[PDB]
Amino acid sequence: MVKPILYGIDASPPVRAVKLTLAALQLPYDYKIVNLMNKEQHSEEYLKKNPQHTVPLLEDGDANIADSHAIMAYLVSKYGKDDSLYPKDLVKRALVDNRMYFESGVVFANALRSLAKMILFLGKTEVPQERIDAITEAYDFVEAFFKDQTYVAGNQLTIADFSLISSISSLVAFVPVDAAKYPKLSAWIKRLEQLPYYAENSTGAQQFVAAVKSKPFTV
Amino acid sequence: KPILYGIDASPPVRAVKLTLAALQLPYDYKIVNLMNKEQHSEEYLKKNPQHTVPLLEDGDANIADSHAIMAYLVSKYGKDDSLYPKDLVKRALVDNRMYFESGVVFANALRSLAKMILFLGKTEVPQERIDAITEAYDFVEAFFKDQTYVAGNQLTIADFSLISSISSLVAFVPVDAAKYPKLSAWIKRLEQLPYYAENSTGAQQFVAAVKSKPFTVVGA
Ligand SMILES: N[C@@H](CCC(=O)N[C@@H](CS)C(=O)NCC(=O)O)C(=O)O
């Protein structure tokens, strides 16, 4: 009976996407803190587990999986007692995959990580307008995802919603979501806030926001 | 036949083209010229509001994102799963490497620089954009260990994803074969595939487009 181990810290958006998924699956697991501020991802012990020095990492028995999106797909496929969260139908799965690849690059790499690195790590107090533009571009794209639908990848909650909420709920540290401009995006956030296990995201999202607010900058 | 929307110079388009060739799946190819802003036409925006390529239409289905498209293609049309294994541990590694490509390689290192130079008319590139490329090469060199592919001992769609972007990044930073012997050997391995010209043709066009827009790098 495998109980997996998750490595991470709650402030990290992709770690929170995996925390939401584990909670949705009601799957017990051990959680090991990798304090990124203590540069703990660069330890010799952790670099053996993950040469990319990133979190989250999941150890599942003898398996070692990095990347929140790979981890979430793996978790649902192995332990999911239905497949609503990651449907087996190929066209619907492709939409969930598409939305997670979108989160990986357009949201996380291009908008979030870039700006967070500048502010939280490099101590910059001025950032170019393009870093703010990356954020509003992401919001604009996600607003358009909804159409006549409730969630980012269909009419059911999927791991793509967990992926995208983890980062969008972090980006609001930099640019709050204008509810008038983004009504569908705002409603979707409100909907997810009502999940019984949403604190697996909101606690760390609030920590991320607090860390960002303590490092002011101009543009 | 499936329909693929793209242009050969685009890296993620070329990852899909490689996949289609590997699968021997005939398709209609519709060229969307990005330099002429054809992705912003009323008709293309209807098909894909993100105005991106590649886009695949298959019957009444629509799939965007090269990595989503490739996984779908192998799972739907592959005669076996070698290019995208059904085993969950093996699949997770392929997924991991494609997610890595999408963010660390494509969004962070390639698209950033290419948009600046090719589309936005900038000639001054911060040293940070060059650092983002060498970081990527360092990460990929480390994937191999004793294996010959990025996601295990057999060719997978993760190889097609990473070669499409790495073969474009050399426009900016040629791969030092002394520093990156495994990455170099892997490129040479893929170059042997009978259908590799589905990547090399457009990669050369990408390189040519970059050489036509001279730039300098700024920063210690
Ligand atoms: N998109 C990747 C992101 C992984 C990532 O970059 N995690 C950051 C924390 S938000 C990290 O580990 N930074 C530590 C480092 O790069 O050294 C995923 O979904 O897992």
Ligand SMILES: N[C@@H](CCC(=O)N[C@@H](CS)C(=O)NCC(=O)O)C(=O)O
């Ligand atoms: N994550 C996507 C990237 C798609 C993408 O950014 N495509 C570029 C071409 S390299 C594009 O369509 N640019 C046109 C635009 O954004 O308007 C994938 O793997 O397919």
